[PDB]
Amino acid sequence: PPLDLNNIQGDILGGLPKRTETYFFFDVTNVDQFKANMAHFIPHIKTSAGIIKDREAIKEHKRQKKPGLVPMAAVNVSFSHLGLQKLGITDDLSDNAFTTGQRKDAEILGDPGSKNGDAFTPAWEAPFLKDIHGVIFVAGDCHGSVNKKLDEIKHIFGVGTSHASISEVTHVRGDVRPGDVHAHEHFGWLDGISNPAVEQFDQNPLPGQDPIRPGFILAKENGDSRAAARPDWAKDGSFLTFRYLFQMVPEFDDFLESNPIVLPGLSRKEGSELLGARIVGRWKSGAPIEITPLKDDPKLAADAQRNNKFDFGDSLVRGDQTKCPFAAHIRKTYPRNDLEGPPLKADIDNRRIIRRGIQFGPEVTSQEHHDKKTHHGRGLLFVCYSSSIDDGFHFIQESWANAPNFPVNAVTSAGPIPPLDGVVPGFDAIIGQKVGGGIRQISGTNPNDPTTNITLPDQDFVVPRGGEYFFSPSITALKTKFAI
Ligand code: HEM
């Protein structure tokens, strides 16, 4: 069937274009007044149709050399399980992670925290330990637009006044980095390269971007295995995972400088760069190591038609880590042929996620660089979408990233593979977390010596400090279940 793009919130399919973005986390205080205000709010919501239409208007305005105008920052909205309960919307959405809420789920994600008996409290910023009912987020070209748009939303809900239907728990702000590295995350890598193409939305998949069915992103659409268990209003909504991930950049840079790979043809500097590339699965530029294993290639990196056309072939079955470690970040989170090829021939479309991350915080200072220690908060506002957090984000984090035997344990489940005997890939070095904060190791990072492990510093390079699981309903769901 064709998708109704006027019904689907625009951050999901399309993505809200942004140099800056504010996420406003709130609690409902008066349910009836909240539902009445939502009638006024809903017309402000950007849909996927809206996105495509804007993108064309920007292209014509830009082809035509006009003086370059304010993209009326787009608004989206998303609700936690605690907010659905609060609103009287009690139909089960058949996802344990969402319904559990991420404060609890975080124990199993591997977040640092502590236990009173069987009660777990993650080591998050104080506001993310309160009940959050939803998030209103607004994304645009500059601070002026976003704030102006957000002030208007706050008038609609009466924020701060005696007649208020929501209150602020906290807010967070993302900002693309300055200049040439605007799309690079704070460790230095080009981010936003690989996302799944969606059948009946993405007209021209890029090479290496196998399109998946829309029900793996949107509830009750084609390919949602849980379609029959879900209520009609859930159609064309998607689960939004938010993770407030702080990055320890000077500690990461220092880590690389201390562990250079000694390899014919490379400086000390270059061996430290090779290690970073191998840990991520790409050069900072964006060039995938599976294509260019030993030196960066900036032209390949800048070309969307060549920079994602690889699948690890049968390197895993053969035990061959020469081009790419098994435990590289991108391989841990999208295995490609490691699982889709023999022996498993597994269908991992339900493990795919659409990422809409934005960076935050200042650049690294001279003092921070000199100390080789972090002094300011910076990192990534991580946001991803799928029709199942249980199958997507949670699983990726627990069974792949945090699992030092993955992917060997997956492919050896079918029968031992002698070239993998004794291979323990190790942790995803970027996001892998060990429960209790124990010792993490990663193997295969030296092309010439695949069995040597690096023991990671106790201070993780990425440190979660907040997050929650939300559901982003359709325009029509909002209109009938959240309005009046
Ligand atoms: C500080 C945190 C993180 C950083 C710095 C980071 C960095 C990156 C980079 C540099 C890429 C490659 C460029 C691209 O394809 O976009 C990437 C891809 C990806 N990351 Fe992350 N990441 C982070 C957290 C996460 C988390 C929490 C998840 C999921 C639980 C995740 C899942 C993925 C996936 C699925 C891909 C795409 C794999 C592919 O299709 O090739 N990442 N990440």
Which helix (H) or strand (E) covers residue 81, if one does? helix 81-86
Phi-psi region of 55 (alpha: psi -120 to 50; beta: other; left: phi over 0): alpha
Q: Which ligand 1 atom lies nearest to the CA of residue 308?
A: 41
Q: Find the 126 Cα to ligand 1 centroid distance in Å.
A: 26
Containing H/E element for 273? Answer: helix 268-280
Q: Given the CA of residue 462, which atom of ligand 1 is nearest to it?
A: 1
Cross-strand partners of 171: 24
- Please state, in angstroms and rounded to a whole number, the distance separating the CA atoms of residues 225 and 212: 13
Which residue has the CA at smallest separation from atom 24 of ligand 1? 431
User: In 323-440, which ranges are continuous DSSP H helix?
Assistant: 329-333, 337-340, 366-371, 393-395, 408-412
* DSSP 8-state secondary structure symbol assigned to residue 291: T
Q: Write the residue with the smallest CA distance to atom 32 of ligand 1.
A: 333
Chain Cα centroid distance, residue 466:
14
Among 43, 64, 51, which Cα is nearest to 14's?
51
CA atoms within 13 A on the CB side of 129: 11
DSSP 421: T
Query: Bridge partners of 380?
Result: 245, 359
194 is in an annotated binding site: yes
Query: Count of domains in the chain?
Result: 1
Contact in structure between 292 and 443 (CB atoms under 8 Å): no
Consult the annotation and say whether 117 binds a ligand: no
Query: Within 13 Å, how many C-alpha atoms sit on residue 395's CB side?
Result: 16
* Ligand 1 atom closest to Cα of residue 333: 35
CB 414 within 8 A of CB 423: no
Residue 204's nearest CA partner among 301, 107, 304 is 304
Contacts of 2 (CB under 8 A, 6+ apart): 200
State the Rg of the chain over Cα. 22
* 15 annotated as a binding-site residue: no
Active site residues: 191
192 in a known ligand binding site: yes
Q: Could you tell me the CA-to-CA distances from 333 to 84, 349, 391 in Å, in that order?
A: 30, 12, 12
Q: Which of 186, 194, 385 to mutate to test the pocket of ligand 1 (most atoms within 8 A of CB)?
A: 194
As a whole number of angstroms, the distance between CA 109 and CA 124 comes to 13
- Can you tell me the distance from the alpha carbon of 213 to that of 35, in angstroms, rounded to the nearest whole number? 33
Q: How far is the CA of 55 from the centre of ligand 1 (A)?
A: 25
Query: Atom of ligand 1 at shortest distance to CA of 353?
Result: 35
Give the Å distance between the CA of 188 and the centre of ligand 1.
Answer: 13
Query: CB 37: neighbour CB atoms within 10 A?
Result: 22
Helix (H) or strand (E) holding 28: strand 20-28
Q: Which residue range forms the structural domain that includes residue 199?
A: 1-484
User: Are 423 and 318 contacting, i.e. CB atoms less than 8 angstroms apart?
Assistant: no
7 Cα–ligand 1 center, Å: 28
HSE-CB at 342 with a 13 A cutoff on CA atoms is: 5
Ligand 1 centroid, distance to 152 Cα (angstroms): 34
Instruction: Tell me the two tokens of residue 330.
Output: 């991108």
Reported structure resolution in angstroms: 2.5
Output the CA 276–ligand 1 centroid distance in Å: 14
**134 appears as a binding residue in the annotation:** no
- All residues at 6 or more sequence positions from 56 whose CB lies less than 8 Å from its CB, including other chains: none
329 annotated to bind ligand = yes
Q: What kind of experiment solved this structure? A: X-ray
Query: What does the angle CA 401 – CA 402 – CA 407 come to, to the nearest 5 degrees?
Result: 55
Tell me the best of 300, 312, 355 to mutate to test the pocket of ligand 1, counting ligand atoms within 8 Å of each CB and taking the most: 355
In this structure, the residues whose C-beta lies within 6 A of any atom of ligand 1 are 185, 187, 189, 191-194, 243, 245, 247, 280, 282, 329-330, 333-334, 353, 379-380, 382, 393, 396-397, 430-431, 462
Phi–psi pair at 174, nearest 5 degrees: -110, 150
In whole angstroms, what is the distance from residue 27 CA to residue 30 CA? 9
